[PDB]
Design a protein around this ligand. Structure first.
Ligand SMILES: NC(=O)c1ccc[n+]([C@@H]2O[C@H](COP(=O)([O-])OP(=O)(O)OC[C@H]3O[C@@H](n4cnc5c(N)ncnc54)[C@H](OP(=O)(O)O)[C@@H]3O)[C@@H](O)[C@H]2O)c1
Ligand SMILES: NC(=O)c1ccc[n+]([C@@H]2O[C@H](COP(=O)([O-])OP(=O)(O)OC[C@H]3O[C@@H](n4cnc5c(N)ncnc54)[C@H](OP(=O)(O)O)[C@@H]3O)[C@@H](O)[C@H]2O)c1
Ligand SMILES: NC(=O)c1ccc[n+]([C@@H]2O[C@H](COP(=O)([O-])OP(=O)(O)OC[C@H]3O[C@@H](n4cnc5c(N)ncnc54)[C@H](OP(=O)(O)O)[C@@H]3O)[C@@H](O)[C@H]2O)c1
Ligand SMILES: NC(=O)c1ccc[n+]([C@@H]2O[C@H](COP(=O)([O-])OP(=O)(O)OC[C@H]3O[C@@H](n4cnc5c(N)ncnc54)[C@H](OP(=O)(O)O)[C@@H]3O)[C@@H](O)[C@H]2O)c1
Lengths: 240, 242, 242, 243
C-alpha cells in the first residue's frame, strides 16, 4: 500500500487528483487548509468508490506547522510514496500596484511551500527504499509569464526551477520529480474581458477540466513513468 | 472500434507502442518497411493477448506508395482514429564528413514522412467525426542537438515544428497532435562501444537507458480519452537528461 | 579582413544584415538567387558607406551549384569567417491542401540549405584558424508552430536542431553557431490582408512589426568578438510574442 | 537626454563589468553596492577615468523598505532611471534535505524578492519620463535547467525568469523592454570550486572554459542599445553551449 499526499484536496484540481489516484489504488492523504467539509467530501467519495485515505491539515506557508504535522503523519503511518504539491493562490494586480501582501502571500504560499511541504517527506521517502513520486503544480503563467500576475508567474516559474533541480538530486534514488503546468482550468480559482483574452490564445477554445489534470498526474504517478523526470508537462489546450 | 496506425511496428519502440495500444483496446495497423517477420511477431503477440490488428507495408520516404497504400486501407477499413509516426533512421557522421546520402536519407525518411504518412490520414480522420490522435516520435537530439548527428537533430527538430503547427490547425476538430522525444532507449537502433555508452550515461541522471515499453506507456497516455486537452506538446522521456 | 557570406542579401533581412555587418567592418559576400539588381543595390550602398563586398549567386536548393560556387569563392578569396544562412521561402496552405511542391520547395530550400550552404564552408573556416561565426535564420513558427504553415514550421524548426548540433561540434574550434528567430518582420515576404494583420498584431505585445534593421542589430551582436561564449542558442526577436 | 542605468551589485564581478561597459556606451551609471563601498568606488573610478559618468548608492536588495527609500530619493534628486540591471545575487548551496531555513530564505529573499524590491519603485517614474526604457535581470543556467545541490538557487533564478516574462508583457506598449540574461559558469568571486569540481563542470561546457564577466557585459550592452527595442520577454543564455 503506497500512500500519496495531495495538498489542496478539498476542491478543484487537488480533489480531482485525490479521487483519481485513490481509484488507481493509492492511499490518499487528503490535505486541506481551512475547508474541512470539502476535504471530507473528497474522502467520502474516495471511500464510496472502494478506495482509502485520511484527512490532514496545514498552512503550506507555515513551515513549522508543515514539519510538525508531516513528521507526526510519517511517524504514525510511514513515509509517503508520493507527494503532490498542488495547493496554490493568486493575488493579481498590475506590477506597480502590487501590494507587499500581494507579492509575499503568493511567493510564501506558492514557492516556499516546495521547501515546507516537500523537505520533510524526502529522507523518509529515501529511507523506505520503494522509490517515489514528486509532482508539483505550476502554471502556463510560470512558463510564459502573464500580465497582471508578475507575482504568480514568478512563484510558478520558481516551482519549475525547484522541481528540475530536485529531479537531478533524486534520480539515482528512483524518485521522479516532475511539474504539471495547467493552462486555464475550470475551478473556483477573473473578468469576462480577461477570460476572452485567455480563450483567444487557446486553440481548443475551451477550459480544461480538473479531471484532465488528474489524468496526467495519474500517468506520472504510475510505475511505467519511472524514466520521466525533470519535466514540465503542460496541459493547456495547445496554448504553448 | 478505433484503429491506430503505428509505423515501424516490426521492432523496438514501434512494436512496444503497438502492443500497448492493442492492450488498451485499439485495433492496430502494424506497419513495417522490410521486416515482415518482425511485424508478424508483433501481430501474433497482439492477437495472443486478445487484441486485434493487421499488417501493412510501405516506405515512409516513398510518397506515392504511402498515399496508395493508405488510401486503400482507409477505403477498405475506414479512417484511422490514431496515427503514431514512429518509423525513423540515423546515419551518423561529423558534419563535414556527412555524405549526400547520409543527409538526404535522414531528412527524407524522418521528416518527409510527416507529410507522406500523415497527410493522407487527415481528411478521413476529420470526416469520421470521432476526433483523433496524432503522435510523432522525435528525440532529445531534436530538442538540444547532438554532436555527430546534425542530420538527425535537424530531422527530429523538424518533426517537432511540424507537430506543433498541425496541433494548432486540428485543435478545433478534437484531434490532438503531440510529440514524444525519447532519450536513449534500449533497441536495435543504438549501437555503442562501452566507452561511448559511458559518455552517454554521464549525461543521464538516472544512469540507465529507457526501455521501449516505457516509451509505449507515454504513447498510451497520449492516446487515451482523458488526454484530450494535451496538444502541441513535446514530452521528453529521457531519465532527466534535460 | 574577415569575410561574411550573407545568403539572400538582395532584399529584406539579408540586405539589412549585409549593410550592418559591412558597417561593422566585415567584407560581405552579397548573395542572391535571381535578383541581381537587388544584390547590386545592396552592394552599392555598402560601398557608398565605405565598406567592401562582392556579388555571388546560387540556388540554395541546388547542392552541386552551392558546392561549386563556394569552393571557387574559397579558392579565390580564402575561407569565410562568417556565414549567415538567411535565404528562405514560404509556401503556405492548410496541411491537407499542401501540394507536393509546397512541402518539398520549403523543406529543400529552407532546411537542405543548411547542408548545401554551410558544409562547404566548415573545413576551410577551421583551416584558417581565425575561429568563426555561423548564424542561421529560423522563425517564431519554428519555435511554436504556426497554422497554415506546417511545412515552414517544420523546416524552420529543423534549422534550430541543425544549429544546435553543429554548435556542439564546433565549440572547441572557436566557431559559434546560433540561430535568430524573428517574429513578424516588415519585408516583401509578408503578404497579409488588414484582417489577418490585426489577428497577428493581437499576439504581439509591442503591437508592431519588427524592422529588418532590428534583425540586423542582433546579427551584428552575434558576429562580434565579445559574443564568443554565446553558442547553441536560438535568440528570438519578436516584440514579446513568446 | 543623458540616460541613467542602475546596476545592482556593481562593486565586483558581472555587475562591475556591466557598469563599465554601459558607461563606455555613454549611459550614466548608478553604481550600487551592498557592503563593498571600496569595490564600488573602484568601479566608479574606472568609469570616470575612461571619460564616463556615474555615482555610488547602496541598499540591501532583501530590505524592501530601504530599497524604496533610497530609490525614491535617487529618483527625486536625479530623475527616473532609463535602465535597471538587477544583477545582485547570492548562492547558499546544500543538498535539498540538508538545506537550512536560512539557506532557503536568504536565497529566495535576496535573489527573487529583489525583483519586486528593486524594480517596482523604478517603473512608474520610467513610464513618467516617456523615454521608454530597459529592464535586464540576471538569472542563471541553473534557473533554466536546474542544478544539483542548488534547489534554492535554481528556484530563485527560475522565478526571476517568470517575473521577467510577465513584466515584459505589461510594459511592452510603453516601449520598455524586459529581458533576462542567464549566464553559465562565469569567472568571478561567486565561484569557489576545487580542481575536481571544476573538471566536472567543464565536461558539460562544449567550449571547455568559463565565461568572463566582460562577455556577460557585452550581452547587457546589446540589450541596452536602441537597436534592441523589439527584443523583449526573452531569456538569453551565455554559457559556452551548455544548453
Ligand atoms: N485553475 C487554474 O486554471 C490553474 C491554472 C494553472 C495552475 N493552477 C494551479 O493548480 C493548483 C490548484 O489550483 P485550483 O484552481 O484547484 O485551486 P483552488 O480551487 O483555488 O483551490 C486551492 C486549494 O489550495 C488550498 N490552499 C489555499 N491556500 C492555502 C494555504 N495557505 N495553505 C494550504 N493550502 C492552501 C485550498 O484549501 P482550502 O479551501 O482548505 O483553503 C484549496 O484546496 C494551484 O497551485 C494553481 O496555482 C491552476
Ligand atoms: N532507440 C533510441 O534511442 C531512440 C531515441 C530517440 C528517438 N528514437 C526514435 O524512435 C523511433 C523508433 O526508434 P527505434 O529505436 O524503435 O528504431 P528501430 O528499432 O531501429 O526500428 C526502426 C523502425 O523504423 C522502420 N523504418 C526504417 N526505415 C523505414 C522506411 N524507409 N519506411 C518505413 N519504415 C521504416 C523499420 O522498419 P523495418 O525494420 O520493417 O525495416 C523499423 O520498424 C525512431 O523514429 C527513432 O528516431 C529512438
Ligand atoms: N519577414 C519575416 O517576417 C520573417 C519572419 C521570420 C523569419 N524570416 C526568415 O528570414 C529570412 C529572410 O526573410 P525575408 O523576410 O528577408 O525574405 P525576402 O525579403 O523574401 O527575401 C528572401 C531572400 O531569399 C533568397 N532566396 C529565396 N529563394 C532562394 C533560393 N532557392 N536560393 C537562394 N536564395 C533564395 C532571395 O533571393 P532573390 O531575391 O535573389 O530571389 C531573397 O534574397 C528567411 O529565412 C525567412 O524564413 C522572415
Ligand atoms: N558567476 C557565475 O558563475 C554566475 C552564473 C550565473 C549567474 N550569476 C549571477 O550573476 C549575478 C552576479 O554574480 P557575480 O558572480 O558577479 O556575483 P559576485 O561576484 O558574488 O558579486 C555579487 C554582487 O551582489 C551584491 N549583493 C550580494 N548580496 C546583496 C544584497 N543583499 N543586497 C545588495 N547587493 C547584494 C554584492 O554587493 P557587495 O559586494 O557590495 O556585498 C556584489 O556586488 C548574480 O545574480 C548571480 O546569481 C553568476
Amino acid at each position: 500500500s503506497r500512500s500519496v499526499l495531495v495538498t489542496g484536496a478539498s476542491k478543484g484540481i487537488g480533489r480531482a487528483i485525490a479521487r483519481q489516484l485513490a481509484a488507481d489504488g493509492f492511499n490518499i492523504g487528503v490535505h486541506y487548509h481551512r475547508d474541512a467539509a470539502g476535504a471530507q467530501e473528497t474522502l467520502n467519495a474516495i471511500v464510496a468508490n472502494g478506495g482509502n485515505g485520511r484527512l490532514l491539515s496545514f498552512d503550506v506557508a507555515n513551515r513549522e506547522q508543515c514539519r510538525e504535522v508531516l513528521e507526526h503523519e510519517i511517524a504514525q503511518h510511514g513515509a509517503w510514496y508520493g507527494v503532490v504539491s498542488n495547493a496554490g493562490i493568486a493575488r493579481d494586480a498590475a506590477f506597480p500596484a502590487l501590494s507587499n501582501d500581494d507579492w509575499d502571500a503568493v511567493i510564501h504560499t506558492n514557492l516556499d511551500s516546495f521547501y515546507n511541504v516537500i523537505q520533510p517527506c524526502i529522507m523518509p521517502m529515501i529511507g523506505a527504499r520503494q522509490g517515489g513520486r514528486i509532482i508539483t503544480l505550476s502554471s502556463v503563467s510560470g512558463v510564459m509569464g502573464n500580465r497582471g500576475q508578475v507575482n504568480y508567474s514568478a512563484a510558478k516559474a520558481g516551482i519549475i526551477g525547484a522541481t528540475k533541480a530536485l529531479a537531478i538530486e533524486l534520480a539515482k534514488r528512483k524518485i521522479t520529480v516532475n511539474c504539471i503546468a495547467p493552462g486555464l482550468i475550470d475551478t473556483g480559482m477573473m473578468e469576462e474581458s480577461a477570460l476572452k483574452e485567455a480563450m483567444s490564445m487557446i486553440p481548443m477554445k475551451r477550459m480544461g477540466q480538473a479531471e484532465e489534470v488528474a489524468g496526467l498526474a495519474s500517468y506520472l504517478m504510475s510505475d511505467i513513468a519511472g524514466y520521466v523526470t525533470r519535466q514540465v508537462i503542460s496541459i493547456n489546450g495547445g496554448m504553448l
